[PDB]
Design a protein around this motif. Sequence first.
Motif, PDB file in Angstrom:
ATOM      1  N   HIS A 175       1.024  -1.259   0.009  1.00  0.00           N
ATOM      2  CA  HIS A 175      -0.196   0.040  -0.052  1.00  0.00           C
ATOM      3  C   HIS A 175       0.824   1.223  -0.040  1.00  0.00           C
ATOM      4  CE1 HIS A 175      -4.309   0.667   1.113  1.00  0.00           C
ATOM      5  NE2 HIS A 175      -4.245   0.935  -0.280  1.00  0.00           N
ATOM      6  N   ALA A 226       0.811   4.259  -2.945  1.00  0.00           N
ATOM      7  CA  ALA A 226       1.059   5.740  -2.517  1.00  0.00           C
ATOM      8  C   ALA A 226       2.221   6.498  -3.092  1.00  0.00           C
ATOM      9  CB  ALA A 226       1.011   5.767  -0.769  1.00  0.00           C
ATOM     10  N   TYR A 227       3.402   5.610  -3.347  1.00  0.00           N
ATOM     11  CA  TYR A 227       4.511   6.440  -3.902  1.00  0.00           C
ATOM     12  C   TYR A 227       4.330   6.403  -5.274  1.00  0.00           C
ATOM     13  CZ  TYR A 227       9.231   7.559  -5.471  1.00  0.00           C
ATOM     14  OH  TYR A 227      10.106   7.979  -6.031  1.00  0.00           O
ATOM     15  N   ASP A 244       1.552   6.578  -7.016  1.00  0.00           N
ATOM     16  CA  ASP A 244       0.334   7.270  -7.167  1.00  0.00           C
ATOM     17  C   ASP A 244       0.633   8.859  -7.191  1.00  0.00           C
ATOM     18  OD1 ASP A 244      -2.381   7.494  -7.989  1.00  0.00           O
ATOM     19  OD2 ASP A 244      -2.351   8.283  -5.525  1.00  0.00           O
ATOM     20  N   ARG A 245       2.124   9.108  -6.887  1.00  0.00           N
ATOM     21  CA  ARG A 245       2.367  10.658  -6.693  1.00  0.00           C
ATOM     22  C   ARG A 245       2.554  11.272  -8.107  1.00  0.00           C
ATOM     23  NH1 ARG A 245       7.462  10.681  -2.589  1.00  0.00           N
ATOM     24  NH2 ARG A 245       6.262   9.484  -0.588  1.00  0.00           N
ATOM     25  N   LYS A 270      -1.284  -1.502  -5.668  1.00  0.00           N
ATOM     26  CA  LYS A 270      -2.676  -1.306  -5.058  1.00  0.00           C
ATOM     27  C   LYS A 270      -3.484  -2.606  -5.034  1.00  0.00           C
ATOM     28  CE  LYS A 270      -6.314   2.122  -5.114  1.00  0.00           C
ATOM     29  NZ  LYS A 270      -7.297   2.942  -6.060  1.00  0.00           N
ATOM     30  N   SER A 300       8.509   4.835   2.991  1.00  0.00           N
ATOM     31  CA  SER A 300       7.504   5.661   1.950  1.00  0.00           C
ATOM     32  C   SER A 300       8.115   6.032   0.855  1.00  0.00           C
ATOM     33  CB  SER A 300       7.175   6.965   2.864  1.00  0.00           C
ATOM     34  OG  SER A 300       8.201   7.979   3.060  1.00  0.00           O
TER      35      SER A 300
END
Lengths: 194, 196, 196, 194
Positions: free
Chosen positions: B52, B56-57, B59-60, B73, B107
């Motif tokens: 996840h 998130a990375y 999706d930047r 995802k 992250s």
Amino acid sequence: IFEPFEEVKKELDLVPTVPQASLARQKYVDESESAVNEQINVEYNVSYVYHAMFAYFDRDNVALRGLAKFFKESSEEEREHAEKLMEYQNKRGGKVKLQSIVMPLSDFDHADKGDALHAMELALSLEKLTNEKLLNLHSVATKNGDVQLADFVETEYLGEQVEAIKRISEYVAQLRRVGKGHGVWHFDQMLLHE
Amino acid sequence: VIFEPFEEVKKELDLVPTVPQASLARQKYVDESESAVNEQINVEYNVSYVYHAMFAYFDRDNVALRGLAKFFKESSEEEREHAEKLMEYQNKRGGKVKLQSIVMPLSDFDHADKGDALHAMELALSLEKLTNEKLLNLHSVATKNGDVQLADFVETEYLGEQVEAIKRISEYVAQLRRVGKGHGVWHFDQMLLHEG
Amino acid sequence: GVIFEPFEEVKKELDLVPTVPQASLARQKYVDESESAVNEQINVEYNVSYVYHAMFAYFDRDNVALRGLAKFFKESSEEEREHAEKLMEYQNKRGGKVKLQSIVMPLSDFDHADKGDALHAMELALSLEKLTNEKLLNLHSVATKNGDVQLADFVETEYLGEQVEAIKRISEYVAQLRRVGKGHGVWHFDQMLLHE
Amino acid sequence: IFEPFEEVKKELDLVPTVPQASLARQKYVDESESAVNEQINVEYNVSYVYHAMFAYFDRDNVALRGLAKFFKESSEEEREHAEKLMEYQNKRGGKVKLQSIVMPLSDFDHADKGDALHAMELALSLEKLTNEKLLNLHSVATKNGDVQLADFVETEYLGEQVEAIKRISEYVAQLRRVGKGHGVWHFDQMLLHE
Ligand SMILES: [Ca+2]
Ligand SMILES: [Ca+2]
Ligand SMILES: [Ca+2]
Ligand SMILES: [Ca+2]
Ligand SMILES: [Ca+2]
Ligand SMILES: [Ca+2]
Ligand SMILES: [Ca+2]
Ligand SMILES: [Ca+2]
Ligand SMILES: [Ca+2]
Ligand SMILES: [Ca+2]
Ligand SMILES: [Ca+2]
Ligand SMILES: [Ca+2]
Ligand SMILES: [Ca+2]
Ligand SMILES: [Ca+2]
Ligand SMILES: [Ca+2]
Ligand SMILES: [Ca+2]
Ligand SMILES: [Ca+2]
Ligand SMILES: [Ca+2]
Ligand SMILES: [Ca+2]
Ligand SMILES: [Ca+2]
Ligand SMILES: [Ca+2]
Ligand SMILES: [Ca+2]
Ligand SMILES: [Ca+2]
């Protein structure tokens, strides 16, 4: 407490760098890789022998169309068994090594038993031999502690092999019951439409 | 051969728990096995969380690798499913699920030399290999304890699938190395975005 | 690189083919102890089928009138006979000889003043399923001890996971019966089961 | 000519109050209840024997698939016959009492007749035995003046039993006509696809 990035530091370093090495390979020893290659060759050999048997029964003077069809389809199925193992080899990051295939017998006539019975008894023996080879592959996996290889063999091959042996055994029994001549031809008609 | 159900049933009849807190189902399932299953639940949940973070990375807006974002995802959701199946298994066997803490994941997944995409796929490969090692550990605990059905469950529901997951990600790593950084990575990502 | 020569290696396999009509042609690496053990398990399953049929016959009484429980036991009996039949078919697949054994008379009455009939019967069912599990694991042990790989795998694959699920299912019924209590509660639980 | 509530208050006080007593049971004497339980055991036993027959003909070396299928289906049908009687026992407020089932023969080979003919002759004999038992059950019902039990047996069982006996008799006759070997195998193919 399980820390992925702490325990994965080492793993990330083990990732192969040279282009020819498998990236996927994990806990898959050389002896296991070789045993899989051996079984690929066993299945391919049986495929080839069945093709020889098809070619014999497809002769105009033999004219057992059911047997010809059965062996033709069996040959194709055996090639698929070999291909599944080739794909498995690659899933585990082993390298497939196809070996030579020896010339099979071409003639399957038998004075006493008759061609049909002789061929089915040979097929039975070939499937029993294949079972021995599969059990050897399983033994190699178990010896080497390869849990997933042993499971793959059990799940994809061993039960299927028991069923194949029973199927052919039933054919042998029926051929023995019906006898040569009209009986054999009739059994062949059954097989043609089975 | 000879078998008298009502005679032999005596053993287990008076072994039926009476206190509300005790499992009625639990049979030949030792504490060590129960603990090992809880440990693996945590391993899978951990991996879900890490994927996840990777989603998130990628999706930047400045990273903009939509294929990788989608892959991670979906991978995160699948991992949570792997954890849940083990939670359900624990209950089938009459063990008690004990969810543990989940640690903060990394992250940032940039990498100067490899590039972000290749670095993240190599990390994903390593995570899947680590998970395989843990699954095989769990199988070993079951075998050591003589738990036939636990061992069978792990092989049947997890091990073959794990081998497939590892080959899949290995192929991604290989393709990313072949295409190289820049246009190639972007193109690979487009492929992954529309992958069937 | 010739590593395998079928026509050389089959000669042994060929001169081993039975000619005596009563002998199995298929039987291969299937020892007497395994054959006997499979026959024992067939009898276990058949006995359980018979017991469930007796329980059906009790709950189908006009004065008992628990239709959901009667339906459940009737279906369970049929399913158990299928378990027996699958083992009979397996015996023949391996070239063993099926030997059906006697089936003992089961109990006919399942009344229970303190627990109530429904809870009593479900607890009995649970104990019978746990007993069957012990028997299946015993069969698995015979296979493992004799080195019969495919027999062990058959038992694991076709029976062991299923047995775990059956045990949890009935455990849940016991728990629910205990929660709702005798009378209206039991009748309501039975309606649920009738329509489950 | 008839006042329900005059005649019903006596009937109403006869309604059982204890939970273990059947509320439905009426004019159903112990001998009838016992005879029904006896027939349940007869049918269940025949079911078991047919299952033994299936297990024999399903052997790889016997390989008569039509006979195997016939006996497997007959076993299931016989169990249904037992269950219908169990249900009937409960309709009448009798208590079902399942009894032990004896170990059946396991082998059905026969040197002279051949396996198929021998098994069909045994099946015919079993069905005739069942018919005798059903007729006896009907006799018990009649002796005791149980009109509806007698009716149930003739309606649900007796006609079916006559059909079953003719069916198997025809199988015996055909097996005798075709003879051992090819003939038996062919009959079996017919039965397999019947
Ligand atoms: Ca094969
Ligand atoms: Ca293909
Ligand atoms: Ca190499
Ligand atoms: Ca397995
Ligand atoms: Ca299989
Ligand atoms: Ca078959
Ligand atoms: Ca996972
Ligand atoms: Ca879910
Ligand atoms: Ca505990
Ligand atoms: Ca295993
Ligand atoms: Ca799997
Ligand atoms: Ca692929
Ligand atoms: Ca069972
Ligand atoms: Ca069936
Ligand atoms: Ca024997
Ligand atoms: Ca299963
Ligand atoms: Ca459930
Ligand atoms: Ca009948
Ligand atoms: Ca039914
Ligand atoms: Ca009574
Ligand atoms: Ca009449
Ligand atoms: Ca009728
Ligand atoms: Ca007719």
